[PDB]
Amino acid sequence: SMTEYKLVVVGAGGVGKSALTIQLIQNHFVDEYDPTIEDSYRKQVVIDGETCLLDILDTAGQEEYSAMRDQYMRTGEGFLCVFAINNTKSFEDIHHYREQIKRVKDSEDVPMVLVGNKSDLPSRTVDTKQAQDLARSYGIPFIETSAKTRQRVEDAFYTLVREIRQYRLK
Numbered sequence: 001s002m003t004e005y006k007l008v009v010v011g012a013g014g015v016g017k018s019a020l021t022i023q024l025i026q027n028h029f030v031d032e033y034d035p036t037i038e039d040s041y042r043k044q045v046v047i048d049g050e051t052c053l054l055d056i057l058d059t060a061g062q063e064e065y066s067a068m069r070d071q072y073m074r075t076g077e078g079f080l081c082v083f084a085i086n087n088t089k090s091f092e093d094i095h096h097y098r099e100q101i102k103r104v105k106d107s108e109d110v111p112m113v114l115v116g117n118k119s120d121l122p123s124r125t126v127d128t129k130q131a132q133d134l135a136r137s138y139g140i141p142f143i144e145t146s147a148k149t150r151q152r153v154e155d156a157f158y159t160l161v162r163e164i165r166q167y168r169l170k
């Protein structure tokens with residue numbers, strides 16, 4: 001009695017895609033993780049009484065054109081779109097990742113969660129209000145996380161599972 005969920009973590013270089021994924025799977029914070037390493041991680045968790053197998057792809061994709069990135073966006077069921085709260089450019093980049101995914105899916109309606117990572121850093125440049133407004137405009141949840149302190153790390157991934165589960169009924 002198990003359900004699979006294929007999750008893809010996307011976002012600009014250095015926002016904490018790897019740190020978030022490794023904190024969820026391995027319960028440690030990576031200080032200086034090779035920016036080019038792209039790996040999948042599988043873990044069983046219980047969410048809302050369901051035993052879930054999470055298959056998570058940690059992407060490191062800054063290529064403009066990539067057959068393999070199109071393939072993982074076709075295969076992925078839900079997308080964690082991560083920016084860093086101290087990097088305005090990473091926040092502006094979200095629009096481009098969302099557009100790429102909608103194009104591959106040929107759908108305006110795709111399970112996504114907006115994640116503002118590095119909430120432990122004091123010098124914020126992205127107002128929580130702007131991030132909430134962007135998420136509202138996309139019709140998706142918004143969560144602020146810290147891969148360093150584990151704040152809302154499970155919540156971000158488990159919220160994305162909940163989004164996928166609900167879309168499966170629509």
Ligand SMILES: O=C1c2cc(cnc2NCc2ccc(O)cc2)S(=O)(=O)NC2=[SH]c3c(Cl)ccc(O)c3N2CCCCCN1[C@H]1CC[C@]2(CCCN2)CC1
Pocket residue numbers: 006007008038039040041055056057061066068069071072073075076077
């Ligand atoms: O070759 C790709 C790999 C496989 C694929 C896509 N991108 C991959 N790497 C990222 C990449 C590679 C080349 C490139 O030019 C651009 C991006 S795939 O579509 O054929 N397989 C997918 S899509 C996917 C989603 Cl959407 C969610 C969860 C998944 O597990 C998943 N998978 C299967 C695993 C992908 C693992 C990333 N890899 C390798 C696989 C082999 C290895 C070495 C040993 C075990 N892990 C290194 C990582």
Ligand SMILES: Nc1nc2c(ncn2[C@@H]2O[C@H](COP(=O)(O)OP(=O)(O)O)[C@@H](O)[C@H]2O)c(=O)[nH]1
Pocket residue numbers: 011012013014015016017018019020030031032033034035117118119120121145146147148149
């Ligand atoms: N302070 C803080 N640093 C973080 C956080 N997440 C990641 N980092 C750091 O930011 C850098 C980039 O993280 P990484 O996970 O490699 O980013 P990726 O390129 O998106 O995979 C590393 O130096 C991490 O230690 C966070 O929540 N808080």
Ligand SMILES: [Mg+2]
Pocket residue numbers: 017018019033034035036037058059060
């Ligand atoms: Mg990385």
